[PDB]
């Protein structure tokens, strides 16, 4: 079972309303475990899953210290970029940052990431080799030269390949029951007459973890990709996920159609058929 650790950082300027908004959230695979909100009263990194609540005050005091340092860099960054693009001080702008690491089924480093966007577009990203940078424009090229001269990539590499994966492993061990579990999908199908010569067949997958899943319809064993309505995998609210797939079936043809479900929590892919 491959795993990842990821932090997502959102910074938004609020012209004439004071300091910019800053949200930090941390995830292990598809489970959120911490948060920081600039507008909340605690002004601290806060637990968002029971298993991390067992870390003591040194852990929390340290994460709070580092999350405040991130916020402060993002506060200076909004003004730097604004100057780089010669932008007015009246418009609201958006900065986003994402970093983390993935490990494979052996729990060993597979890849590390550090990406950065300005107003929803790629601004600067660390390449896969963890030594070079991908700059989206001249403003970005200016950030690149700065980060190159301060040896930022080398510092990131030591974090993503070392510390990042070490703490991922610690987290996987500590939140074993939550994070090392798989919840196979609970499946069912519904049939709803739409008219008198056709009907909607819906295939459901519920209460599954993790979120990755393949849910497809076939007619005589042939893919119906183009003829399927497929919703985006959505969160149930309790740590599990849901998804459905539907097709409009001509009268008397229910038996030509099969619903296919692939998921980590299933020992063998399921083949369902209304009958």
């Amino acid at each position: 079972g491959s795993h990842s650790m990821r932090y997502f950082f959102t910074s938004v300027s609020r012209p004439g309303r004071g300091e910019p908004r800053f949200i930090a959230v941390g995830y292990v695979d598809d489970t959120q475990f911490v948060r920081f909100d600039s507008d909340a009263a605690s002004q601290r990194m806060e637990p968002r899953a029971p298993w991390i609540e067992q870390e003591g005050p040194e852990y929390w005091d340290g994460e709070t210290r580092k999350v405040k340092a991130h916020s402060q860099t993002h506060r200076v960054d909004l003004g730097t970029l604004r100057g780089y693009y010669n932008q007015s001080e009246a418009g609201s702008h958006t900065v986003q940052r994402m970093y983390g690491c993935d490990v494979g089924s052996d729990w060993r480093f597979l890849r590390g990431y550090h990406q950065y966007a300005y107003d929803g577009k790629d601004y600067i990203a660390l390449k896969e080799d963890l030594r070079s940078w991908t700059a989206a424009d001249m403003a970005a090229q200016t950030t690149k030269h700065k980060w190159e001269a301060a040896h930022v990539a080398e510092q990131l590499r030591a974090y993503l390949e070392g510390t990042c994966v070490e703490w991922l492993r610690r987290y996987l061990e500590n939140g074993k029951e939550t994070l090392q579990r798989t919840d196979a999908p609970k499946t069912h199908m519904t049939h709803h007459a739409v008219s008198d010569h056709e009907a909607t067949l819906r295939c459901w997958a519920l209460s599954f973890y993790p979120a990755e899943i393949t849910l497809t319809w076939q007619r005589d064993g042939e893919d119906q990709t183009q003829d399927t309505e497929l919703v985006e995998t959505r969160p149930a609210g309790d740590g599990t996920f849901q998804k459905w797939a539907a097709v409009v079936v001509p009268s008397g043809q229910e038996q030509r159609y099969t619903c296919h479900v692939q998921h980590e929590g299933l020992p063998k892919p399921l083949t369902l058929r209304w009958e």
Partner: peptide, 9 residues
């Protein structure tokens, strides 16, 4: 476990 330090753009 957050990284540190964090350099400006």
């Amino acid at each position: 476990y957050l990284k540190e330090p964090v350099h400006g753009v």
